[PDB]
Amino acid sequence: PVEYGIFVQRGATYTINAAGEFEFSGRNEKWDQALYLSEHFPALFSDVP
């Protein structure tokens, strides 16, 4: 629960920026496949420490 809080505060998604930096959502939204084509990715697989 604790690490989950620390992770999910960052956001459940992110977008790669035009500069290439990651930009996490900051929000705990449930993912939907409609997002798969959206700019967003799931945050678990960001591989960002």
Binding site: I16, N17, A18, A19, G20, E21, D47, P49
Partner: protein, 1057 residues
């Protein structure tokens, strides 16, 4: 120094081991050592472990079997703290044993070992065709010519390329790699040209200007962003390297152009290649923030895409249109040519343009990293402003800037216990003087003293003023850090006042260590605690001046007549614990135990006596003057009768009150009373309350009555104020050249582009202005800038609005401050006493000057850096005659200020006083132009010359400041003079050489002999309140103790015609 001087060399090839070393490249017998074999580190903030193998191993692919080793399990094993060095060394060593590269050692000295292929084949566990080739023919890894190292494997495999995974530099992160490198079979330059041209037909690939092992290799990125971070890291590398070559220093550069060439890439990479090629001045200036490097580069490419400079814009655009070409400066190309000369068959990128670099004259200021920039704004500059729009400063959070009402005073602990004396002057007290002084005293008391004086006396309490120092001493005693101090030292007293517990030394100069688990609470102090302590120290200093120990003598006693809790009685009882037989008691009408509760005058029955008495009596009740008078008189009467050394308080020290007290001591039979007015450093800075010091002496006291004494004038000059006290405003709008701002300070924030503008506008009021961005990513710059009246009196003399705006725009964006820490500005900053006395001088002379009619100009001889400018009205011309003054003909012409820049000639024949002029001689008469003090007879002589020279002029007014002799008599007996001294009987203000002082009587007699009209005036209390209000200054403690005796004894002669 144009030509680049660099030894180019294939460092990656140099890193490849001779084959014989491969057997022991792991150094299996000996443990890996930090800083040689590896470089472990733990970023505790990020909580991220980072192990970096050194030497050949820095390039190392890991088989999944290698990852199954415990050494890689360690960072997960220690989420919080650093991996202990024993476990790191042991595990890394065992894994180092675990690795063994395939090789065939051979005698040839020309041979190397294809370490890349060796480790790679190992990491795949020899399942790739390269792995089979190596496992079957390990000798193929040996190579003489670096290129044929791969050509052998290509001809042997029949492939046109291999695609090697890249190493992650830290071995702990296992994250998927951004890209992989692809080694090509292209032995000739022509094959390389073909592979490049084909490479421009396919997505997300890029390559180096030249390749290691002289074999062509192309990066292939798994995503666009990965390419962007790669390109940015390389642009940093080439920019730094070119920065070293430009300085001309020899460099061991791996290749002349360290940055990448896109072959196929997105728009954003083509932008990166273009600004990267440009070598923009902005990198050398540190204008970009490197925290988010690629972003900075994108924005920079934006500014270049539509640059004001046509050359730079057309050059950037050209670089963007043909990104596959490698643009490079001519100085690079000559290096490339030298390299082609040394190694004729070397491969390097064929498509290249040699542009001429475009010079830019704009040197941006910069300094990344913590630290606010403390600007000193110029009054004027090259920029001409015209009707500048008002510059709103944004609201700022307390997360960034807090505004404490008063600056706590930084000070040595001993200085708190200093005090100043003022001995009586008058030999007699005529009855008419009694009626006059009583009239002034009753009239003053009946209408309460100045409201602004009260606002200051209550805003700046001594207790909160000394608080950080006392709490600091308590905080060090609690940690056990404090150790040595003398038994009688003032530091011992401060220690007794910092902590509730009894202290006992284990021996000389060594206090007892705290018992374990015991942390005694800080000693409780009301506002009058430190003051009572200082009056005690003053009593010990008055019994004899030689003493360093402040402990009472055995079989002696003291009383603190004013008492409630009376914490000082407790701190004193605790200070003298090792002394036998020392009675110490409070004795107020409000007294709590230990202190006895009793009214003063003492009951006829009760017997009270002591060798010392510190009265602090002060009725809370509002009362008629007759009752306050009789009460204070009876208080001093019993205080004198009960002790040989009373130290009575006087709440309303009018000349009438103190003199009546002396008349009362004169009335008592058979005991003549020496007496002196006194004021400690521990008193509230603005209190006019004074401690009269009574003591019998066998001789009758010549000159016992007071008249125009310093401590008294600190009180009586204060009176009901015509205007309401000036509350310090916090301005947020910076109008251009308004002159409408009340005393206080600008504070707030602005967008950083607007920052140079605001500095160009707040320069009109603020003399100096601190600024800072709070973060690299936060565009606003916070700005604090207090309003200096001297800067106003200077800048508003004429309507021109020039400033150094062109300099300030050099600052943006990194050049004007950075600080994450919250900053705490004060509405009332600390100042040394001499400066405040100077401002009181300026207030007195300015109010005196506004009264005069029809005066053409103010001539401040010895005016230094325009320091007297606050006095002179904005209309009349100002003139400086100080040799020390710097010349600024633009500022002089623009602000109506003539500057002689020559020594003044005091000889009467050389004198040239104009009619209708105001000649300022503020503390200039006492020194020679080189700074050596003039002898006092020479001072009185030059005063006599300025006096006689003015005798002819129809309208003129001199203001000759000088020091009265009496002050040396007072500072010989006082203690609270950290700045002022008395070296061999001469005054020594600030850092100036000691200077002999004039006597007031001989000077007034001399001016009577001259026949000139004269008046010896000094600044008053209201002038002090004016200085402190207008400047945003609080007086401080030692300054408040010495200011009365010092300012009263720096008279300003007022010659007039």
């Amino acid at each position: 120094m144009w030509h680049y001087t660099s030894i180019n060399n294939d460092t990656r090839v140099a890193l490849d081991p001779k084959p014989n070393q491969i057997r022991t490249i792991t150094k299996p017998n000996t443990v890996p050592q930090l800083g040689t074999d590896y470089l472990y580190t733990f970023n505790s903030q990020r909580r991220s472990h980072t192990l970096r193998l050194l030497g050949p191993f820095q390039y190392f692919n890991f088989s999944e079997t290698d990852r199954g080793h415990p050494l890689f399990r360690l960072p997960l094993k220690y989420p919080s703290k650093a991996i202990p060095a024993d476990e790191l060394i042991d595990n890394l060593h065992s894994w180092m044993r675990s690795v063994h590269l395939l090789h065939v050692r051979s005698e040839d000295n020309t041979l190397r070992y294809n370490w890349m292929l060796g480790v790679y084949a190992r990491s795949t566990n020899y399942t790739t065709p390269v792995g089979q080739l190596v496992v079957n023919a390990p000798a193929i890894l040996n190579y003489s010519n670096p290129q044929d190292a791969f050509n052998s494997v290509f001809v042997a495999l029949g492939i046109d390329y291999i695609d090697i995974p890249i190493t992650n530099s830290n071995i702990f992160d296992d994250s998927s790699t951004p890209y992989n490198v692809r080694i090509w079979h292209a032995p000739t330059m022509t094959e390389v040209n073909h592979i490049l041209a084909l490479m421009r037909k396919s997505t997300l690939v890029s390559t180096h200007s030249s390749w290691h092992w002289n074999v062509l290799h192309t990066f292939h990125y798994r995503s666009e962003s990965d390419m962007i971070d790669h390109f940015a890291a390389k642009i940093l590398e080439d920019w730094r390297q070119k920065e070293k070559l430009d300085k001309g220093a020899l460099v061991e550069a791996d290749r002349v152009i360290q940055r990448l060439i896109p072959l196929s890439s997105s728009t954003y990479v083509q932008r990166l290649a273009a600004i990267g090629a440009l070598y923009p001045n902005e990198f050398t200036e540190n204008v970009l923030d490197l925290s988010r490097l690629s972003t900075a580069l994108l924005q920079l490419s934006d500014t270049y895409y539509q640059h004001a400079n046509d050359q730079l814009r057309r050059l950037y655009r050209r670089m963007y249109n043909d990104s596959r070409t490698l643009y490079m400066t001519q100085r690079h190309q000559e290096l490339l040519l030298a390299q082609i000369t040394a190694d004729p068959n070397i491969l390097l990128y064929p498509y290249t343009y040699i542009f001429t670099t475009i010079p830019t004259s704009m040197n941006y200021i910069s300094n990344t990293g913590q630290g606010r920039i403390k600007h000193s704004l110029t009054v004027t500059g090259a920029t001409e402003h015209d009707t500048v729009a008002d510059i709103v400063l944004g609201q700022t959070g307390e997360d960034v800037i807090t505004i404490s009402m008063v600056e706590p005073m930084s000070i040595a602990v001993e200085d708190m216990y200093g005090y100043v004396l003022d001995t009586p002057t008058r030999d007699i007290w005529p009855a008419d003087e009694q009626i006059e002084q009583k009239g002034d005293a009753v009239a003053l008391y009946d209408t309460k003293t100045s409201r602004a004086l009260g606002m200051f006396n209550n805003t700046v309490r001594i207790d909160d003023l000394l608080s950080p120092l006392l709490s600091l001493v308590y905080r060090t005693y609690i940690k056990g850090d404090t150790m040595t101090m003398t038994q009688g030292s003032l530091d011992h007293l401060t220690l007794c006042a910092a902590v509730d517990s009894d202290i006992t030394f284990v021996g000389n100069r060594m206090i007892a260590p705290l018992p374990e688990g015991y942390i005694p609470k800080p000693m409780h102090r009301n506002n009058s605690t430190m003051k009572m302590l200082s009056l005690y120290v003053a009593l010990k200093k008055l019994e004899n001046f030689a003493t360093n120990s402040y402990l009472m003598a055995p079989d002696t006693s003291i009383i603190l007549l004013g008492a409630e809790r009376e914490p000082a009685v407790n701190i004193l009882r605790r200070f003298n614990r090792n002394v036998s037989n020392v009675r110490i008691i409070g004795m107020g009408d409000r007294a709590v135990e230990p202190n006895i509760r009793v009214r003063v005058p003492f009951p006829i029955d009760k017997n009270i006596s002591a060798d010392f008495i510190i009265c602090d009596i002060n009725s809370y009740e509002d009362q008629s003057f007759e009752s306050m008078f009789s009460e204070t008189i009876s208080v001093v009467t019993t205080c004198a009768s009960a002790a040989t050394r009373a130290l009575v308080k006087i709440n309303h020290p009018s000349e009438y009150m103190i003199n009546s007290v002396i008349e009362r001591l004169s009335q008592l039979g058979g005991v003549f009373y020496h007496t002196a007015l006194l004021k400690t450093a521990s008193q509230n800075p603005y209190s006019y309350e004074t401690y009269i010091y009574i003591t019998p002496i066998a001789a009758a006291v010549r000159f016992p009555f007071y008249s125009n004494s310093a401590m008294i004038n600190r009180y009586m000059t204060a009176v009901a104020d015509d205007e309401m006290p000036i509350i310090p405003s916090i301005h947020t709008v910076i109008k251009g050249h308004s002159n409408t701002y009340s005393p206080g300070l600008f504070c707030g924030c602005v967008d950083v582009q607007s920052a140079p503008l605001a500095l160009s506008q707040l320069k009109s009021y603020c003399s100096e202005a601190t600024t800072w961005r709070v973060d690299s990513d936060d565009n606003l710059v916070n700005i604090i800038a207090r309003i200096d009246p001297a800067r106003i009196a200077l800048e508003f003399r004429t309507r021109s609005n020039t400033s150094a705006y062109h300099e300030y725009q050099r600052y943006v964006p990194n050049g004007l401050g950075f600080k994450v820490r919250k900053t705490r500005e004060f509405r009332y900053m600390h100042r040394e006493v001499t400066f405040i006395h100077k401002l009181m001088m300026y207030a007195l002379i300015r109010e005196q000057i506004s009264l005069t009619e029809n005066m053409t100009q103010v001539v401040s001889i010895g005016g230094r850096n325009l320091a007297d400018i606050s006095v002179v009205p904005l209309n009349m011309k100002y003139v400086v005659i100080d040799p020390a003054t710097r010349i600024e003909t633009l500022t002089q012409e623009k602000k109506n200020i003539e500057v002689q820049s020559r020594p003044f000639q005091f000889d009467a024949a050389n004198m040239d006083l104009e009619n209708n002029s105001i000649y300022l001689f503020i503390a200039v008469i006492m020194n020679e132009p080189n700074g050596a003090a003039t002898p006092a007879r020479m001072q009185m002589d030059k005063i006599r010359n300025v006096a006689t020279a003015m005798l002819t002029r129809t309208n003129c007014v001199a203001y000759i400041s000088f020091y009265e002799a009496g002050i040396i008599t007072r500072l010989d007996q006082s203690t609270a003079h950290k700045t002022i001294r008395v070296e061999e009987g001469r005054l020594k203000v600030a850092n100036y050489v000691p200077v002999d002082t004039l006597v007031e009587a001989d000077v007034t007699l001399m001016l009577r002999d001259i026949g000139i009209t004269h008046e010896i005036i000094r600044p008053s209390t209201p002038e002090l309140i004016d200085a402190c209000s207008n400047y945003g200054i609080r007086l401080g403690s030692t300054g408040g103790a010495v200011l009365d005796v010092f300012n009263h004894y720096s008279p300003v002669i007022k010659l007039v015609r």
